[PDB]
Amino acid sequence: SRHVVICGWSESTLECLRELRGSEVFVLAEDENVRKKVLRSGANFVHGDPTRVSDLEKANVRGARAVIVDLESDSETIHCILGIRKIDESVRIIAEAERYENIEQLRMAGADQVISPFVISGRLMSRSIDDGYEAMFVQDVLAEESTRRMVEVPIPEGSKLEGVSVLDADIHDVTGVIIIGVGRGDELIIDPPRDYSFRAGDIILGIGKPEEIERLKNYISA
Amino acid sequence: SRHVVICGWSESTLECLRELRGSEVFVLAEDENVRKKVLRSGANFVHGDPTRVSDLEKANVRGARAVIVDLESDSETIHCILGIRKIDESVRIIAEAERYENIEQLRMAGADQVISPFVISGRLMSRSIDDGYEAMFVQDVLAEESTRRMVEVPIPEGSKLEGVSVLDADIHDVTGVIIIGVGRGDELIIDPPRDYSFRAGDIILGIGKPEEIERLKNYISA
Amino acid sequence: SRHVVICGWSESTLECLRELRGSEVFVLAEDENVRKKVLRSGANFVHGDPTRVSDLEKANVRGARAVIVDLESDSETIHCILGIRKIDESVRIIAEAERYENIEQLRMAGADQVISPFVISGRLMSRSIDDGYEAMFVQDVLAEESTRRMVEVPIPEGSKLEGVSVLDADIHDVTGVIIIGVGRGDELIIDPPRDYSFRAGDIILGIGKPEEIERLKNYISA
Amino acid sequence: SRHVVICGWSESTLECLRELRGSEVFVLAEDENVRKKVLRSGANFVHGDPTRVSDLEKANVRGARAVIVDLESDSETIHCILGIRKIDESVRIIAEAERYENIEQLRMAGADQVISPFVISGRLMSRSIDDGYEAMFVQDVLAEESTRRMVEVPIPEGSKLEGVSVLDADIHDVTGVIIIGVGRGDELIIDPPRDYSFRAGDIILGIGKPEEIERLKNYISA
Amino acid sequence: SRHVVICGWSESTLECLRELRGSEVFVLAEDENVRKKVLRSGANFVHGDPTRVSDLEKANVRGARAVIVDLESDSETIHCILGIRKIDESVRIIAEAERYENIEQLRMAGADQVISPFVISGRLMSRSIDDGYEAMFVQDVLAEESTRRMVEVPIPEGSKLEGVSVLDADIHDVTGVIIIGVGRGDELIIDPPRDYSFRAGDIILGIGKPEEIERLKNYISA
Amino acid sequence: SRHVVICGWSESTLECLRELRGSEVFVLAEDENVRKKVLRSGANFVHGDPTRVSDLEKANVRGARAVIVDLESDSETIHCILGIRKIDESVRIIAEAERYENIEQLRMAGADQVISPFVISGRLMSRSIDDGYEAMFVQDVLAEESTRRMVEVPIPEGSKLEGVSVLDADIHDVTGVIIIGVGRGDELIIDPPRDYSFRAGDIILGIGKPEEIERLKNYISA
Amino acid sequence: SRHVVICGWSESTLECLRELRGSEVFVLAEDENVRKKVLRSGANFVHGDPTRVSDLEKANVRGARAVIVDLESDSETIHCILGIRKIDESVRIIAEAERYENIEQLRMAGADQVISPFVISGRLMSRSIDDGYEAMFVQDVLAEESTRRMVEVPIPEGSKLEGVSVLDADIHDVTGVIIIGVGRGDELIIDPPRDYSFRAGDIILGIGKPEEIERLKNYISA
Amino acid sequence: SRHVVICGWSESTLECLRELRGSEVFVLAEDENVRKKVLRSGANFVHGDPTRVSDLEKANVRGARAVIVDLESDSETIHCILGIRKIDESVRIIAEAERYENIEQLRMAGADQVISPFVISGRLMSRSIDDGYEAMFVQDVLAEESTRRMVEVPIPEGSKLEGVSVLDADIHDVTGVIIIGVGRGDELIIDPPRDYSFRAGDIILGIGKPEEIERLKNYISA
Ligand SMILES: [Ca+2]
Ligand SMILES: [Ca+2]
Ligand SMILES: [Ca+2]
Ligand SMILES: [Ca+2]
Ligand SMILES: [Ca+2]
Ligand SMILES: [Ca+2]
Ligand SMILES: [Ca+2]
Ligand SMILES: [Ca+2]
Ligand SMILES: [Ca+2]
Ligand SMILES: [Ca+2]
Ligand SMILES: [Ca+2]
Ligand SMILES: [Ca+2]
Ligand SMILES: [Ca+2]
Ligand SMILES: [Ca+2]
Ligand SMILES: [Ca+2]
Ligand SMILES: [Ca+2]
Ligand SMILES: [Ca+2]
Ligand SMILES: [Ca+2]
Ligand SMILES: [Ca+2]
Ligand SMILES: [Ca+2]
Ligand SMILES: [Ca+2]
Ligand SMILES: [Ca+2]
Ligand SMILES: [Ca+2]
Ligand SMILES: [Ca+2]
């Protein structure tokens, strides 16, 4: 599609940039000694301060399709998001919250998806005292190397599933995928109850083998 | 149960300490200026250096039921795990990996489970460009504020589900809990196929409402 | 009326505190060695961090009539403003902008008015090269020691001036105050034209002697 | 004309440098890491220590038409003003006070103008608790982007208004310019009373549209 | 006598406080970490900033008999001398000059005597290349451990030496004290010639043993 | 004569370097930004660390006639003095003691003349509370601009003054110079008693006009 | 021969680099400000992070004949040794321990030698309280400037001393070399008892004059 | 006998303190948070600065039998040694040199023996490239756990060995200790030649079993 802009350089945006090989990525960071490791990862580098609007317009934030913001603290991640909202009001911003209490401020400044790593990791430790199958499930469906891949299929308009119930559909019996949640717009419903009825435009978040996913796109098609 | 020792003090172990209320936690850290924040959360403080084998013995690593290791670097986390396996050879170690390439060296040193947050947050930011439900699923089932919970139920000895296959048991149709994976020992099989046979001592990893969980524990009992 | 919260301590808010003798003022700042200066100037002190919602609600932001934000940098002034807009979405926030390009990003954060002193003083030093009356005017009308004081008068309901234009009103000839501007809501018309007709509820900004103000309040009466 | 020497670099002298495009400006400061941004702003840089008289004579203080002094503290601004009066006893110094207390000492040292930003900011914060129209008047007439501009028109020798009082003058009706003060030398009379007569050589401080100001200059013509 | 105020804390004021035992000394400084070392030497501590007029007014500058000023820079010393002359117009000020070119400005700002240590040390280091007796003389007559002392004896009213010339009086031959200079008011005449006439109220600066000082004080009495 | 080496750069060595114009001075300092001010003062610059023996052997310490050592602290001054004494055991070193208690250590390390500026300044402050003629004498006889110059004349072998006593000589009656001290070798006797007898090779430290110094050089000659 | 890789830069690896003149040495360290002194020492510099396996493979660890690892702490030395054993499982690692406790962990990680300086220093301090001859023996046989040198002469296959005991050998009388130990593999027998017989392939650790050592090699000849 | 003072706290003196269990040790260091480590290891603590003569005499340097100096840098180790040589000119000072070029400048300061650990460890890492027996010998004979201990025996007065050469003595063939060196006073002859005749008072340095030492002390008897 279009290009992706990454403001700030940390260990989170490094691992993001491995799964973005084949897209056109511009990285915006203040330290000049990080120019080599960015250019090794297949991403163009732009030297500047990410909080400044004049250095943001270097990195093509206007036409971009997503802007991934991970600066050093949350004071600068909020200040960098509002600089982006001054340029383009409709671009999709994915922040990253260092502390827990700054998740609600980061949504008010304009971020469409706040991903806090230290709360996800902090809750996978205390759920792995007794038995650690929760921390093995989170770190195996996100990797693009395992056998079971967590995908998102949209329900087309003109589908055979418009208006049908879930128990009337029974998608795990026919396709082999596990419907862990159906989301509409900006909301996601984990474990949809039986009286939930599909609509065209909803997103079925599922887990399965890539053969079982190709059977699902035939089941929702016209 | 026995107590839980936390080596190091950062934002990951701060969120682990909020979920360890009620149990007994010792936090072992270098600074004298962190004593006020550990005592405010409900955990006794042990001033020391976690890389030393002598100061680990102050924090009662022997009688622990799990040790949670998160120091400033990856090199100090590898050293602190070797210090624990010098003391006790069967205690459980949960460690935090900063770089991706030190996951194989943190497990060889003796960590029973390695939780890498910057790989998790890196893979969620690359997946939330198009639509962010992969970041919303992982951040809601781990929080103790949602409706659906991700829990681990064991198969007791002499159950009704001894030897029974998955397509015959129908855990999702009878109980209504979503079965995302079945765990045995230290391996997890996400989306078990139709030929999978349940055994005694297995761990079922499931997502459902708390009322749905009560129907599962009554279903797999003896 | 109610109290006033001042977030952060600097030379801007120190001059704000002298003009607020008589009311009740809470000052919230991170240093503990600013305590003896604040209690000597007539205001209660609250030790805390102005960017944390836990220590903003200790200083009673909830029922305040205005909260005055002036922190060390513009990264934290945008953070402290969103911390107030999470607590109360209707309180009045007055912020001080250090630099010029952060004025639009401090209004998007939620500040009701942004006072940039280094843009005011930067433009008064440029206008004082030839003859210095621009800096003598601004620094005299705000000081409450001089004869001519710059006050605002609100137009009450059903006044004699309702619906009349300023050309037919002739405020300077019958009252003697100098109407430099008249504002409705959050806009202001400095030097309003002759085609401007007054309305009920407007705030008339004028400069004059205090004897001329009491002549005007009885002239704008209903 | 002649040049303008700026001693010290801060945020106030940066905004002063924007309005001095078209003049020749020598900036004299101690930081070497500010050489690029001064030369970006269209100003020749002269490295030195501004408190030292051997370095002030580098930057051509003698042939200056104004010296704008704003150093890091108030102690160095008094020392930099004492150094200038040793070189030229008649050059125009525009200072900047940090504290309120030093305005009487920065003017006894020799500065012909003291523009304190933290007192104009401190009195516009506490005048914006109720309704912020005083701050919207100060920050709108100083910018060279609004419609109304605060100008200074001098009275020529032999004018049509030589000797007449302001009440018989009727400046706001024939021209439209709001007359906020009349200045003679270094004394400004805000809201001149009706007994005040004009004199030859007076400087009129007015606010109006640019087409009204050209009506004002031709009305006071000889 | 009255007390002695010391503004600033460095090595010069430390040796001055070592030789001011018995009298009452207040030391006015910025740091809170100098209180133990001021209190260990026998001087009460007044925490403040000496550039402020109020914190100078705390330390009883009005009733002092001399104020000793040695701050971190020369600009702060000039500002502190201006503050003391703002408070009291007749107290004695002794100040330390760091650079040679600020002696004229420290005397013009109001110091009654300026003692420049780095000029003294530079001249003694330039004079001790060939043979170092100048440094030994200046460091030897000022210490309170030698045999010979450098003291000032006044000429009382109606003395035996009223009106008498130097070649007639023979202070070195009768008494045995070395007369290096005779001082009147604020001027010193080192090596007065043969035509010099003593007057009442003069100050004789002499070097000699204490018994020779007793003989001189008995010689110039009435 | 030969050349002079100055280790370190401070105000003391600068004021020393003003009085050494006409000699060949090498300055050794670690900061590279001081090359301009050294090259302005007529002294060649050598970049290096003055504590190192190789960077000392760069700066020609072997053939030098005096080495003037003023580094940042006293530890580095002692270390540089021992580094010099490793190279040449017989070169004359003039140190500079920052604190009082390091004078004996600087003498044991190898310095031939320790000049502490801060002790001289502290004693001249404490002796100038009442009347300030001692500071005027000390700062007036060292300058090479006043009328009375403190010189050192050697007694030649074959003089008319070999073996004569002071009271038999009476040098102030014949020449006009004031014998403030006669020194032999490394010792100096201030105010020589009457039974002191001259020897050939002694140094007469005197104060007087240069014509009186010429008359003294004729009086001690053969 | 092949090259030698030095990981980390400190004072120990600087003195090791002096005795490796004639070899090809690659230094791998993180500081860029050490590039000049490494290239002064005759060693190629390879910038990188030595704890990272992608940067150890830069410096050619695979084809090395020894790797000398000495990083800033003991935690990084264990991590750097674990990284090397992943690359080459048979290369010779010489480490350096900071604490005493980590010698058993630095050898279990894979180092074939651990040379702890702070334990050799700590036992030579407390053996030099009475008479310091043990410290004068350690620091004199290691330098390549004294007359006696500690050498290692191997026993050739088929020697004249194959199978004889040391008591019948009489090495100190025919050669003069003091035999302080005989080593087989990684075990050294200090002061071998008279029942110890020589074997083919043994390595003799001896001390002697260089003319005595050539007498020793020809005496153990085949 | 008497006590031992240790100036400064580091890992060298920590290993010195373990070997000095049983005697009385004072440790003098600037940090107060090293207090709990020192009292736990068996030594009294004295808070102070090791470079000041006031706080060296608090730790009883006067009557000590050896003072062990190891500070943070070589500038302060030379300063602390001269501070001891001002107090007692006959006490024994053992210093640790950080760098190599400061060994000669640490002996001129007055240290009786200088132990450079980074030269010992730097030369052991260079000799362990081919085969590592030089580092195994030095680290084994100093450790008091092994069989062969390196001790010194003094030759008493009137011994059987007085006047005999080492070729006629045959210490190794009779007693069985390995005479690596024999020192008179402050020199040492490692591998003494056959023309060396013994004298009364010499210190014989030998390596052997503890049973061989008691065989030697009865052989060197008188
Ligand atoms: Ca981050
Ligand atoms: Ca679990
Ligand atoms: Ca399946
Ligand atoms: Ca972490
Ligand atoms: Ca997605
Ligand atoms: Ca369900
Ligand atoms: Ca501010
Ligand atoms: Ca103007
Ligand atoms: Ca008026
Ligand atoms: Ca300023
Ligand atoms: Ca108002
Ligand atoms: Ca108008
Ligand atoms: Ca000073
Ligand atoms: Ca001289
Ligand atoms: Ca005398
Ligand atoms: Ca100095
Ligand atoms: Ca005096
Ligand atoms: Ca004379
Ligand atoms: Ca080291
Ligand atoms: Ca010994
Ligand atoms: Ca021999
Ligand atoms: Ca050390
Ligand atoms: Ca070898
Ligand atoms: Ca033996």
Q: CATH no. for residue G4?
A: 3.40.50.720
Contacts of residue C33, defined as CB under 8 A and 6 or more positions apart, other chains included, come to E32
Q: How many CB atoms lie within 10 A of CB H33?
A: 8
What is the CA(A115)–ligand 1 centre distance, in A?
A: 10
Question: Any binding-site annotation on G70?
Answer: yes
Q: Could you report how far apart the first and last alpha carbons of chain E are, in Å?
A: 25
Q: Do residue E183 and residue E94 come from a single domain?
A: no
Please give the Cα distance from D84 to D64 (Å, whole number).
11
CB B66 within 8 A of CB B26: no
What is the CA(E37)–ligand 16 centre distance, in A?
A: 22
Q: Find the helix or strand (DSSP H, E) in which G28 lies.
A: strand G25-29
- In chain F, DSSP finds a helix count (H) and a strand count (E) of 10, 10
DSSP β-ladder status, C203-208 and D4-7:
unpaired
Selected residue of C124, C166, C203 to mutate for chain D interface (largest D Cβ count, 10 A): C124
Nearest C-alpha in H relative to F89: H108
Residue G57's Cβ-count burial label (10 Å; 0-12, 13-18, 19+) is middle
Give the residue from H146, H165, H184 where a domain finishes.
H146
CB F91 within 8 A of CB F67: yes
CA atoms E62, E63, E68, E72: torsion sign: negative
Tell me the resolution in Å. Answer: 3.5
Give the residue from C146, C166, C193 where a domain finishes.
C146
Nearest C-alpha in A relative to C99: A52
Half-sphere exposure of G187 (CA within 13 A, CB side): 3
Residues of B in contact with G73 (CB under 8 A): 75
| E174 in contact with chain F, both atoms CB, cutoff 8 A | no
Q: Do residue B127 and residue B45 come from a single domain?
A: no
Please give the Cα distance from F55 to F59 (Å, whole number).
7
- Residue D142 is part of a domain; what is its CATH number? 1.20.5.870
Q: Do residue H9 and residue H52 come from a single domain?
A: yes
Shortest CA distance to H6 belongs to which of H36, H46, H33?
H46
Q: Which of H66, H117, H142 lies nearest to residue G117, judging by beta carbons?
A: H117
Give how many domains chain A has, as a whole number. Answer: 3
Q: Which of C123, C136, C138 lies nearest to residue D15, judging by beta carbons?
A: C123
Which chains border E (3 or more CB–CB pairs < 8 Å)?
Answer: D, F
Shortest CA distance to E139 belongs to which of E130, E148, E14?
E148
Nearest C-alpha in E relative to D76: E75
CA atoms G49, G53, G58, G62: torsion sign: positive
Q: Do residue A46 and residue A129 come from a single domain?
A: no
Calculate the CA D26 to chain-centre distance.
18
CB A168 within 8 A of CB A161: no
User: In the PDB record, what is the listed experimental method?
Assistant: cryo-EM
| Category of E198 on φ-ψ map: left (φ > 0), alpha (ψ -120 to 50) or beta | beta
Residue B192 CA: which ligand is closest? 3
Shortest CA distance to G10 belongs to which of G106, G95, G78, G121?
G95
Q: Do residue E184 and residue E97 come from a single domain?
A: no
Calculate the CA C75 to chain-centre distance.
22
Please give the Cα distance from E179 to F176 (Å, whole number).
12
Please give the Cα distance from B71 to B6 (Å, whole number).
10
Q: Do residue C36 and residue C79 come from a single domain?
A: yes
Which of residues 69 through 108 in chain F touch H, CB cutoff 8 A?
A: 73-76, 78-79, 82-83, 85-86, 101-102, 104-105, 108
Shortest CA distance to H13 belongs to which of H108, H90, H80?
H80
CB contact under 8 A, C15 and D123: yes
Calculate the CA E212 to chain-centre distance.
23
Q: Do residue B128 and residue B39 come from a single domain?
A: no
Q: Do residue H130 and residue H151 come from a single domain?
A: no
Pairs across A and B, CB distance < 8 A = 225
Q: What is the 3-state secondary structure (H, E, C) of F106-136?
A: HHHHCCCEECCHHHHHHHHHHCCCCCCHHHH
Please give the Cα distance from E151 to E203 (Å, whole number).
10
Which chains border H (3 or more CB–CB pairs < 8 Å)?
Answer: F, G
The Cα-based distances of C196 to B123, C155, C164, D216, H166 in angstroms read 60, 15, 8, 22, 122
Selected residue of F49, F53, F56, F75 to mutate for chain H interface (largest H Cβ count, 10 A): F75
| F109 in contact with chain H, both atoms CB, cutoff 8 A | yes
Q: Do residue E11 and residue E112 come from a single domain?
A: yes
Please give the Cα distance from D14 to G9 (Å, whole number).
44
What is the identity of the amino acid at A6?
Answer: I
CB contact under 8 A, A78 and C79: yes
The Cα of D79 is separated from the nearest Cα of chain E by a number of Å equal to: 5
The Cα of H121 is separated from the nearest Cα of chain F by a number of Å equal to: 23
| Category of C221 on φ-ψ map: left (φ > 0), alpha (ψ -120 to 50) or beta | beta
Shortest CA distance to B117 belongs to which of G80, A96, H197?
A96
Residues of G in contact with B99 (CB under 8 A): 52
Which of residues 25 through 64 in chain D touch C, CB cutoff 8 A?
A: none
Q: Do residue A11 and residue A66 come from a single domain?
A: yes
Shortest CA distance to H98 belongs to which of H81, H75, H82?
H75
Give the residue from G99, G116, G133 where a domain finishes.
G116
The Cα of A133 is separated from the nearest Cα of chain B by a number of Å equal to: 7
Q: How many CB atoms lie within 10 A of CB H117?
A: 24
Please give the Cα distance from B155 to B171 (Å, whole number).
13
- 3-class DSSP assignment, residue H68: strand
Contacts of residue B7, defined as CB under 8 A and 6 or more positions apart, other chains included, come to B28, B29, B50, B56, B59, B67, B68, B69, B70, B71, B80
Task: Locate D129 and state its tokens.
Answer: 């608790």
DSSP β-ladder status, B187-190 and A25-29:
unpaired
Task: Locate A20 and state its tokens.
Answer: 């973005």
Domain of residue E132 covers 117-146
What is the CA(B102)–ligand 1 centre distance, in A?
A: 18
What is the identity of the amino acid at B56?
Answer: L
Question: Any binding-site annotation on D70?
Answer: yes
Which chains border D (3 or more CB–CB pairs < 8 Å)?
Answer: C, E
CB A121 within 8 A of CB B120: yes
Please give the Cα distance from A217 to A222 (Å, whole number).
10
CB A8 within 8 A of CB A29: yes
Q: Do residue B26 and residue B98 come from a single domain?
A: yes
- Residue H184 is part of a domain; what is its CATH number? 3.30.70.1450
CB D69 within 8 A of CB D96: yes
Please give the Cα distance from A145 to A141 (Å, whole number).
9
Shortest CA distance to C142 belongs to which of D12, D130, D121?
D121
As beta bridge partners, residue D45 has D27
**Helical axes D134-141 vs C117-126, angle rounded to 10°:** 40
Q: Do residue E17 and residue E84 come from a single domain?
A: yes
| F176 in contact with chain E, both atoms CB, cutoff 8 A | yes
Residue E175 CA: which ligand is closest? 15
Which chains border F (3 or more CB–CB pairs < 8 Å)?
Answer: E, H
Does an interface of 3+ CB pairs under 8 Å exist between G and B?
yes
Q: Which of H14, H130, H141 lies nearest to residue G122, judging by beta carbons?
A: H14
